[PDB]
């Protein structure tokens, strides 16, 4: 029994059991898309300047 994947995983993952899953593997990057409606854009003079 060469040690578990809990202790040997690259990027510092955190292997768990009941769903087989890894946690918090610091690798890659998430891109994001924001479809923002036009109602949220407050005008200039309703904010300090």
């Amino acid at each position: 029994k060469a040690p578990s994947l809990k202790f040997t995983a690259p990027f510092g993952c955190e292997i768990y059991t009941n769903p087989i899953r890894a946690e918090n593997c610091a690798v890659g990057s998430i891109p994001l898309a924001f479809d923002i409606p036009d109602a949220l854009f407050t005008r200039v003079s309703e904010t300090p300047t």
């Binding site: 005008r43 200039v44 003079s45 300047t49």
Partner: protein
């Protein structure tokens, strides 16, 4: 008036009255009178302030 200065707070060339100009003046008498733009550059909302 005497020594009046005009700055543009909001400026958006929208179809409605989408621009705010705050005229910083210094008046000899305190009384209402009429503002106007001679050109077709801007169309003012109110006739007097």
């Amino acid at each position: 008036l005497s020594a009046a200065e005009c700055t543009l707070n909001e400026c958006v060339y929208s179809s409605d009255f989408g621009g705010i100009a705050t005229v910083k003046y210094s008046a000899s008498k305190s009384g209402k009178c009429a503002v106007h733009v001679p050109s077709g550059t801007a169309t003012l909302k109110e006739a007097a302030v």
